[PDB]
Amino acid sequence: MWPSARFVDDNVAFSRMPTERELDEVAKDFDAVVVLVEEYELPYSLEEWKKRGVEVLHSPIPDFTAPSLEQLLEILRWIEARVREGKKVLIHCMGGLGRSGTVAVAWLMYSKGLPLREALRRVRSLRPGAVETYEQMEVLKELEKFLRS
Ligand code: VO4
Numbered sequence: 153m154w155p156s157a158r159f160v161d162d163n164v165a166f167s168r169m170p171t172e173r174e175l176d177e178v179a180k181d182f183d184a185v186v187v188l189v190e191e192y193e194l195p196y197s198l199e200e201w202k203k204r205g206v207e208v209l210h211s212p213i214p215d216f217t218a219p220s221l222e223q224l225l226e227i228l229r230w231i232e233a234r235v236r237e238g239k240k241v242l243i244h245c246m247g248g249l250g251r252s253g254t255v256a257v258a259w260l261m262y263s264k265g266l267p268l269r270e271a272l273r274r275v276r277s278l279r280p281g282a283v284e285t286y287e288q289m290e291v292l293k294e295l296e297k298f299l300r301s
Contacts, residue, residue, distance in 0.1 A: 154178045157242055158278040161263070163235045166256040166279075169246040172196040179204040183239035186227060186255065188213045189246040207234060213251045218287035221294045227255055228262045235263075253282025258295055268296045 154177050157165035169189055170178045175196075178185075184207040187198060191212065201208045209230050213219045219227070234241050243259075245251040253275050260271040272292070275282045283289060 154181050157181070160256050160260055160275060160278065163239070164231060164241045164243065164256070164259050164263075166243040166249070166252040166275075166282075168249070169244050170242075172200065175200050175204060178242060179206050181240060182242040183207060183237075184231075184234040184241045185209070186211065186231065186241060186243040188244065188251045188255065190214060193246055207239070213245070215247065216250070216285060218254065218285065218291045219251070221291055221298065224255070224258050224291060224295060225298075228258055231259060232263065248284055249279050249282045250284030250288055253279060253284070254288040254292065257283055257292055261292070261295060261299060265299075268292050 154174065157167040159165040172195060179201070185201055186209045189212060198208050198210060209227065211223060211227050231241050243252045243255045256275045257268070257271045260266045260274060261268060266274070272283060283292070
């Protein structure tokens with residue numbers, strides 16, 4: 153297994169950005185990637201995933217900002233579809249683990265119905281530092297309200 157990934161359930165993991173040297177490595181373990189990094193900060197083309205048969209969702213979230221609730225719902229629904237196909241999914245951003253950690257917490261809320269408090273604790277247990285900003289926490293609160301309703 154690619155030990156940089158941490159799984160929040162049987163099928164969904166989050167990690168730092170794999171480098172071009174690691175692409176075959178994570179393609180062996182994952183069939184789908186959620187790429188949160190902005191186009192201009194990529195060090196290889198995302199066609200690298202396509203030539204390996206890996207499905208790509210490119211939904212960039214700028215450095216130190218939170219996704220909108222709509223953006224997050226779109227990401228979650230796509231992850232859901234891939235998991236239902238039997239695929240393992242890797243969420244990643246470049247640099248810290250604020251943005252990828254936010255999507256990982258949202259996935260636990262969305263798929264397992266965990267309240268935000270427990271989902272946050274879980275992901276932070278996996279990677280201390282996940283969910284870095286007040287804005288990221290606030291969109292997770294907005295998600296929780298959406299789901300409860
Ligand atoms: O720029 V971050 O993914 O550490 O919020």
